[PDB]
Nucleic acid binder design. Structure first.
Lengths: 100, 96, 68, 55, 131
RNA sequence: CGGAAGGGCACCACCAGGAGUGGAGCCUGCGGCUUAAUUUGACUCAACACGGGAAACCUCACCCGGCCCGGACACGGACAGGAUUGACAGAUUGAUAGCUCUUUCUCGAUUCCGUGGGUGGUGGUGCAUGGCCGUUCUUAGUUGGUGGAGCGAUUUGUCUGGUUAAUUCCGAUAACGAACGAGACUCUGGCAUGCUAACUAGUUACGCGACCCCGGUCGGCGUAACUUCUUAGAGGGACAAGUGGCGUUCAGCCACCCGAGAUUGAGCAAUAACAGGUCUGUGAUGCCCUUAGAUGUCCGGGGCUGCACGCGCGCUACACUGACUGGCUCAGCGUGUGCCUACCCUACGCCGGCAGGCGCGGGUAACCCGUUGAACCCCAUUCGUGAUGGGGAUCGGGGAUUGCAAUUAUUCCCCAUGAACGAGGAAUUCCCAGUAAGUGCGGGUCAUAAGCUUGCGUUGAUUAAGUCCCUGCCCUUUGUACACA
């Protein structure tokens, strides 16, 4: 019953709508929900030179890429939450349903 | 290129079995990733397919570090009369 | 463009007309006479003859050389 | 042996060992997060990988 | 997946995946009015959508080039059979797509139209489309 | 455009100061001078710790040699009565390259040879190009539409002046209304005892357990409440809004209450241009060159460091506001097991003074390294104005690790050696608040690896709220016989 749905996404409002959708689906299917626990955002940071040559003033580019991680833990037999999580998928987020 | 015909026919067989083929540009790669049943050096796949291309039998498209080789009608007819096969059968691209 | 050494010309091989018929002795019967011993080598058995050099014997492709 | 000598030299490390996955040259390589893309090629394709100038 | 790599390396892996896919498809579908790519990795589907202007040229004669392109996709990137599904579709109001309009100008210059006439012909179409 | 006048702005300008650089030693990039070679791009700001360029081989172009074809393709003699590939000794070399002189076996029309045509190229031209970049300039500048004025090119709007970080505004006003750049915008920092949530985060209470004399301590053990502390989502909040002055009474400026803030910091960035940089980022690329004895490429050796010399960026010092030896005590950004790809972050238990070795483990990571016991600083000693226990260059000896390989010492450790340097000439740089500076910790390069650079926190000021004197750039007026100016 104790099953772990984690959502890893680069875009935030996408992830938030998926987090909302799984709470909606859970409270409708009448099963105990642990709310969307927000793990710290990881900021992948790469900083390079701008110029292809080396005949300019030393200006650097600061490239960032945030990656967000939510998880909701439910008390439900595999099936009903599997069919809840088989609907309403968008390209931004990525799903993991963990049983044990 | 100086080639073993055994390895060359095995390349031509796979090329037919699936019309289009991919090959990384790495001439110092000991065995070919796909045809590991055969002892195919990457140099020989490239040299065979670029020799195919020069006469206008294969379609050469190059990305970052990968050759892409689609089969033409000239290649279809040469390849089928060469391997000495039934004229009916075709690559894995045609069958709906 | 000018170079240092007068070059090395690449090894041109001594091509010969029929080095094969010197592998057998002909009889006036319908029989045979095999000149150079047949090594029962892993891959290179019957049709592969051994080498008859002035110091040692040698099997071609498996490289199975023999001191006299 | 010619084939004992052609690729005889060992390459386990140094910048002769690692290669740009786009243009295949051996200067200013990005190896962070397993990119393996030279800094000019990175900067060209950076927005497609997901990297964004924010700060 | 027992290889079990970091979410950090996983997302830069997905980043370069789309980047090369796009490079390959822009090199291939260059002349046939190519707009861009999109990926939807569903449960055990890689639904890989293509956006073009002249989709009849790119999907070809009874789906020759589509199965050719699906083959090189599965062959190069190392995918499972059945799981990878390409879908070429027409982009709406091409007038606003900078990729399509830039490649249209490029192939009018490749034909050999006058340079001021090529640019003003393109720029007039962009504006009447509603830029 | 001026060798004419006037007005503006800026810590890449000055004033007031702070740290300094210049002096010394070493690290390092240029020129020079040697060398078979010491490949080279760049030369005021806008070249010189820059090419992410910390190269032992590779890298890698440079040079001394030796294999190599990876010369597709169409055509022509040649041809299995064999075109051809491979080859073990032996001298040959550096080589266990069949490169070879000299052996005889192997292979089977994919060779090899001329004719074209192709190829590859860190080869040439950045004064033939694209792209990206830098700079003028991050200064405040640029342009229509209707209307006005001129026969017209043109002009007004875009201005005498005040004000602002700002062509920012309100004022005067034949102009009114607008667009780009400024601003707004996105990220970021500070605030919520209000909200949604938490066994990958805690707390409070509790039961238990250990120790000191009912309490006290616990990062000792364990499960009911809750979200103060941690995490990250939604809204809120700040606007020169309140008051007192100054001002054409405007725009706005100065002070003061209340308040978590009364200007946090970046990202982006106009019209127009430069013969600025890159062809050594590209399978962006015109033309040229070369194309088998290669400017292709692999292999093994060295060089890129060479040292009477002159520059530029940095590091360590010149000591007592200190060095040494103990003890006490506090961080924040990250990163971590690989595609070809081999190499990850490390706790813990023994061995060795030390660098290290061996053992079992955790970790694909708010889960394990980890409560990241960092340094400066702090407390207590020894030292005592002595080129001294300051300083640690140079040199000798031994030992570990990385690697296929360290001599022209890769790095690190142990003992010994103890150079100048006593605050630095002309000249010159960066900078106004959690800033300068001191201090250490991560990311890049990385088999080995930071005196560099790119980020992070800790300790934390003196001076200034101004100006056109200096150096720059920008405008208005004026003059012209200049207009490739």
């Amino acid at each position: 019953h104790r099953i772990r749905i984690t959502l890893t996404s680069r875009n935030v409002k996408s992830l938030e709508k998926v987090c909302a959708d799984l709470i909606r689906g859970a409270k409708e299917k009448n099963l105990k929900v642990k709310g969307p626990v927000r793990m710290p955002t990881k900021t992948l940071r790469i900083t390079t030179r701008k110029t292809p040559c080396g005949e300019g003033s030393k200006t650097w580019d600061r490239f960032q890429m945030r990656i967000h991680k939510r998880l909701i833990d439910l008390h439900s037999p595999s099936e009903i939450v599997k069919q809840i999580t088989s609907i309403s998928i968008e390209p931004g987020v990525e799903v993991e349903v963990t049983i044990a | 290129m100086l080639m073993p015909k055994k390895n060359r026919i095995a390349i031509y067989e796979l090329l037919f079995k699936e019309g289009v083929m991919v090959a990384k540009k790495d001439v110092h790669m000991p065995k070919h990733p796909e045809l590991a049943d055969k002892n195919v050096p990457n140099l020989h796949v490239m040299k065979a397919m670029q020799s195919l291309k020069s006469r206008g039998y294969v379609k050469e498209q190059f990305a970052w570090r990968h050759f892409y080789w689609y089969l033409t009608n000239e290649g279809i007819q040469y390849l089928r009369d060469y391997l000495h096969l039934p004229p009916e059968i075709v690559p894995a691209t045609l069958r709906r | 463009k000018s170079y240092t050494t007068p070059k090395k010309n690449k090894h041109k091989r001594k091509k010969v007309k029929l080095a094969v018929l010197k592998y057998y002795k002909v009889d006036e019967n319908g029989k045979i006479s095999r000149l150079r011993r047949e090594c029962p080598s892993d891959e290179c058995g019957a049709g592969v003859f051994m080498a008859s050099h002035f110091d040692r014997h040698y099997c071609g492709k498996c490289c199975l050389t023999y001191c006299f | 042996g010619h084939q004992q000598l052609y690729w005889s030299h060992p390459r386990k490390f140094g910048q002769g060992s690692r290669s740009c996955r786009v243009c295949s040259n051996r200067h200013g390589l990005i190896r962070k997060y397993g990119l393996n893309m030279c800094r000019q090629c990175f900067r060209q394709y950076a927005k497609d990988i997901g990297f964004i100038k924010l700060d | 997946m027992a290889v079990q790599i970091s979410k950090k390396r996983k997302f830069v892996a997905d980043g370069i995946f789309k980047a090369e896919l796009n490079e390959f498809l822009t090199r291939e579908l260059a002349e046939d009015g190519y707009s861009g790519v999109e990926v939807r990795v569903t449960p055990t589907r890689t639904e890989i959508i293509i956006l073009a202007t002249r989709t009849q040229n790119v999907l070809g004669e009874k789906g020759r080039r589509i199965r050719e392109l699906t083959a090189v996709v599965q062959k190069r990137f190392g995918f499972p059979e059945g799981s990878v599904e390409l879908y070429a579709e027409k982009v709406a109001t091409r007038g606003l797509c900078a990729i399509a309009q830039a490649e249209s100008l490029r192939y009018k210059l490749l034909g050999g139209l006058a340079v001021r006439r090529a640019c003003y012909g393109v720029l007039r179409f962009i504006m009447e489309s509603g830029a």
